[PDB]
Amino acid sequence: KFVPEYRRTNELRRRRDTQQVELRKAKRDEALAKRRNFQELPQMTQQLNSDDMQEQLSATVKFRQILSQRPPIDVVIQAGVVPRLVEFMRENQPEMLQLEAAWALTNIASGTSAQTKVVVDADAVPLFIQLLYTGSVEVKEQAIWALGNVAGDSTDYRDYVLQCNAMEPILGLFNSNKPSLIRTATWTLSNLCRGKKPQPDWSVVSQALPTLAKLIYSMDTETLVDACWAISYLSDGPQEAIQAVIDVRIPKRLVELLSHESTLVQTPALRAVGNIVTGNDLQTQVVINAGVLPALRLLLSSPKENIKKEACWTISNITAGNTEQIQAVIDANLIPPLVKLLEVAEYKTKKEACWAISNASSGGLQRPDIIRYLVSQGCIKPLCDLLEIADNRIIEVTLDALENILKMGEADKEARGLNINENADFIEKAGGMEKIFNCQQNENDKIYEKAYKIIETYFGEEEDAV
Amino acid sequence: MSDLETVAKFLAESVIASTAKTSERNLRQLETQDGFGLTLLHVIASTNLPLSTRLAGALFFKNFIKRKWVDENGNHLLPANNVELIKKEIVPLMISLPNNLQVQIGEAISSIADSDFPDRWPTLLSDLASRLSNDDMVTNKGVLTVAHSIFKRWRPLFRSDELFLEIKLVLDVFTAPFLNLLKTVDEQITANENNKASLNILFDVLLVLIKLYYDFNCQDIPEFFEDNIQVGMGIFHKYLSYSNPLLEDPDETEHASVLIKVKSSIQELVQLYTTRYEDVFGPMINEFIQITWNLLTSISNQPKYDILVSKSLSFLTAVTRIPKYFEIFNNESAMNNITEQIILPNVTLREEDVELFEDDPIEYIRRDLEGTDTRRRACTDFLKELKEKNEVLVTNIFLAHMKGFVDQYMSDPSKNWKFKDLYIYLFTALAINGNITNAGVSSTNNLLNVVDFFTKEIAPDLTSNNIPHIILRVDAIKYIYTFRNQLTKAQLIELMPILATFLQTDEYVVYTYAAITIEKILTIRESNTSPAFIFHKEDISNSTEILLKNLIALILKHGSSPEKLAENEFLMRSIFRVLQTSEDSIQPLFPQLLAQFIEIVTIMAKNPSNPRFTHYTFESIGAILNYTQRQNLPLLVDSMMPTFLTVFSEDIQEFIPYVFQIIAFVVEQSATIPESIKPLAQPLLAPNVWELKGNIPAVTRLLKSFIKTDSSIFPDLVPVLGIFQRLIASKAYEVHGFDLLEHIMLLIDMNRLRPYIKQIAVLLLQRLQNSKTERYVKKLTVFFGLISNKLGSDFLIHFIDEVQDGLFQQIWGNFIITTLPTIGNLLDRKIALIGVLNMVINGQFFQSKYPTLISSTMNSIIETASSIANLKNDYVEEISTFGSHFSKLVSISEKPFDPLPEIDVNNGVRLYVAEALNKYNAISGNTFLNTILPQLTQENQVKLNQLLVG
Amino acid sequence: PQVQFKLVLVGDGGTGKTTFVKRHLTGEFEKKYVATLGVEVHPLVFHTNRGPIKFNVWDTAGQEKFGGLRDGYYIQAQCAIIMFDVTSRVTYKNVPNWHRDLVRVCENIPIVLCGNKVDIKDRKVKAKSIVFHRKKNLQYYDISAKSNYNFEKPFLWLARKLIGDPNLEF
Ligand SMILES: Nc1nc2c(ncn2[C@@H]2O[C@H](COP(=O)(O)OP(=O)(O)OP(=O)(O)O)[C@@H](O)[C@H]2O)c(=O)[nH]1
């Protein structure tokens, strides 16, 4: 009997999105990609084509104004002025004319993909990039905003901007004092880093990490939000990407931001920290040494359910590490809150607390006092309760935790000459023996075989007490 | 003449007994003709044929698909032309058939889909969905049943991208028609409120729609069902309360109807949504709680609602575990209304149980002792869940009701005795934290006093001359059983003469529960860190004889037929426990007790019936022998062996593995082989004794005991080696082969083994080339270590090289040092590790002859000594055949042979290795470690320094 | 044996269906496992207080590779016995499959669920786990073909159900 492999059943660390396909309704926690910068058309078009500089400017100012704060983008385009606006950005034009033309084009690029395409096909991008070299602070602010909308439209325009060598001049903007310029440039930079398939050219966007290290030392909330999001995108990668973030010494301040007052900051900061602990034990210890464990304790109590979930996921990739790292989690008093979420939290969060406790128990086979403490904190009952409701993957993870707990109890019985396996008695006392036993009814063979082994090894009418 | 006519002829013959087998053989021959698949479809469609013939054709086609549609790799086995035409005809054919045929064609479609959907059958989904219509609920049921058969395959799967892509494909086709059809079935059900036939049809469709709703949501809640949740769940919300006299009939109390199943399927889906998708479902949970509360309020106690009640309580249990929703009934008013309306009416003792008490006492006891889905159990588990969330509130609310139950009983105990059974049951449920285990109750509710309740409510019912109902006498005994850990030794001692007096009554459940409670009292340990029991021998010695006398009389009370004598295994379990506790208290009576057990064995041999009774009979015999003075064993042996010989000669296989264990123990404990046992030694070696899996562990033990106690009883070692060969050649029995071999090599003088030592090595190593298993190579490695530790390093080298010069170093470098670090069993790891180390530090010949082996051997030693509990810890489904089961007697169990007892397997091994290496280095003038350190891997040079500097 | 009924006996391979029938037919207990190939039909006659009753027992194969006609054997069956082995948890896990295939062919026949081999100590399917019969209104019995425990209860219940006489006795 043949069936498709994914319809058959016959390293604990987990990366961000190993499986991208989703059935659930997509919920956006991310910053909107595009931003807008807040009929006598015939007459304006005549002034814009005029040879007089002051006539050109008054026309450009009007086109920018109607495009500010809804805006008739498609109408301006229909007037055929987009290439003229692009000409006004050329290196040999007046500063104020460049400013207005770039502002108007920014808002045309702020609309639909078709409207952004108009500006891109008009060869505006190389000029924006040039204005980043040559413009005043006011000119540089309009050009970088324009590049943000192009980049935020799609991965293709994101890559086109990078192929035009925009990164070098963009990274020069962050010497400015003007908080509005830093804000806008940080958002544009996050748009150049955003997007999973395809990811941007690593050789180019990793050049931004020194700048991002500086930006997360801003105390401007808006700047921190988009800087942390940028780091969260760049840190979503293999060990090499994580190591580039570690090398610029981002983790210390990144961990500090987990305690920022604003959940708009905590969310991307926690996402980035979560990404970093998906590498190896050495990279993970760098985050531990930065104080992530105390910070995670508070986030387990966050009012945002998604913060609690991501905190549990982050902890689970830490307890996927070595004995000392598991002990560090215990030492930071993270188990009591994890056990609490394991029994009261929403399923998606509860599911993540299960991974964390389960992974800890896998390493607890080498340091039995680890499992003693876990049992001491009352994890057995929540784990067993989870067997009745969980998806099949979480059933398997929960049975592996209970098996580790049973192995430890059995090894402890033999080592100390105890009469009975204490953890097996706890599991039966909590009603967990029946819930494990009932997993044998699952048509999933991996689940059935695991439950059968547990039942027959630890609850199978072993012996008369002698 | 026609091939269609010929197929129909034998399809018809297949329903008749005389031609059932010949017809299949003819059909299998006809099956080779090309197009037979399509010929079957034409037969199925032929309305001129009798329905049974068309049904035989539909069943044959279905099973033809299962046999010959694809091979193990998914290659179609039929001509590519037939394959595509089948897929085109099958769905339209299904629609046109009446139900009995339609369902089998639906199942053939599902079988094709199992291998071909979705990649190799892109049209199926559209094909199926396009057959749904608002005006034909018969065809709808058929189509939806096929869809459910295909989509329910998602339920046991792990999430994956490939699966979610498949699910997405299905949702794009079905979501709109599914919801529309669901939105059409509710409308027609209301319009057809008084049409019985059309109602049953509509609710059949509703049931499958509900199951499909579950299929679509078992992996995640898809976007479509999140958006349309209010209309979807709103409909199910409605039908949880729906009631129509046409779809009900009070005259049926067991057979749940389609309406009942629909509400149960709804509750399954509601619990899925409540426990997985509370974020989305949250706003609607309160509505379902209230309707579930009303549903349980007005539900008849008839069994046909049992499942619906339990599924409703599991929903309410999931709600109790969500703090936000538990608070709506976390107050005295709601909690008290749950008690009166939901819990108490279903916890009372129902008389369907009282009848089991009177008619099948032994079964009543077994089920009472081990326990599901009865209303009592479902409601009691719910009661527990509430108590866990607010113990003070729940306890006090029930203490108030129980207070009134006491007065209801005391007013008229004779008629209201059931009220006392109630609050004893409720008190027990509230007092126990969690569940009782085989070890008893470990902790209780601090708001209740089990000792006070015992003195006031239980103890008087033990000794009262008259009892309103013997069920209360059982309840009192069971209370002692339940709370035995909470009573003092002095309180238990005071109960022992009372429980023992029950063994002289005639009430089946009273004297059995008394025997059970005595046995469990004798199993209470003082603590889990030492083996001592609360009850020592001086606590039972004065009553041992009268307990045994009365337990034996109860066994014999209803006649000495094999089936009735062995009926009550709890009596013999208690005899065993009493014997174990009393030890040598009544040694002078051992000959008479043993004679009584032997007579029981003799009677049961005519028809062994109760395996637990049989087991504890032989445990009891084992206990007697264990506490008999060794010089008195021969007299006991002589009184048993005539019966044991008859067990062999009559081939009572149920007893044979027990008799072998008993005889082995006797031999193990004697300084010489008793004369009555000597004649068994050489017949033991006959190959036919070693054929049944259930006997191998026992005859291996007996053979080992002969070798250890007096190996001269075997004048020829050839047949002993023949057993070893049989065991070691077998993957199933290899462990016993190694066990036997250890006895042979270590306990038989080398002068006797000399003519056979080469052959032994050849046999032992033949497995390596032919049919090696991982367990075999691990056991071989442990065996090498054992030989090294005992007979020495030089012996081991010349034992293997005797097979072929050079074989030692080849096996050492390929199997031993590679396998050593993988041995997970702690005692075996110590033996292997210490034995391998012994070769390096106590093998001057090993060092001088194989100098280049030392570095790789040291790498293996260091890795093994410096490493985990993650390794497989033991050496552990299939068809049971007669005699395939072996049961170990704990009364005469033996612990494994540890040749290195001064080294604890826990931490002593690592310390021992480090001290042995340091010593060897010191004896070498401090040149060994310096010379070998550069030859080790980088990793092991570090681990080694941690060992020495540890 | 003029009153005759087609009884289909189904269940996983090795559960004891053939041993059970042969014990009723001849009284002999078969110790070896020789898998049945497709079906063997065996007439069983009981002499009752309502006359002689004949069961034509279609002893079907439980191993898929030897299944023969499989549920093709169930056509026009008037009753059935589903057997499992109480020492093998998987044979009880497959009981719903056997029952599903039976009722799809025979909608409303009486069916007895038999848990065989209760004479073996290491029982894996306890009465607690055995609940399928209440969900589908089948009669359940523990049986042992070896010890003859409840030997005749399945045929007696079917006979009473088939004749409609609760007082019928063998
Ligand atoms: N101990 C014990 N063994 C039994 C019992 N019933 C059957 N067996 C054994 O179980 C094995 C299976 O025997 P069969 O009756 O041939 O199995 P089956 O159900 O007919 O299997 P298939 O024909 O392949 O479907 C044999 O070894 C029997 O001796 C029983 O009640 N007790």
Ligand SMILES: [Mg+2]
């Ligand atoms: Mg058979």
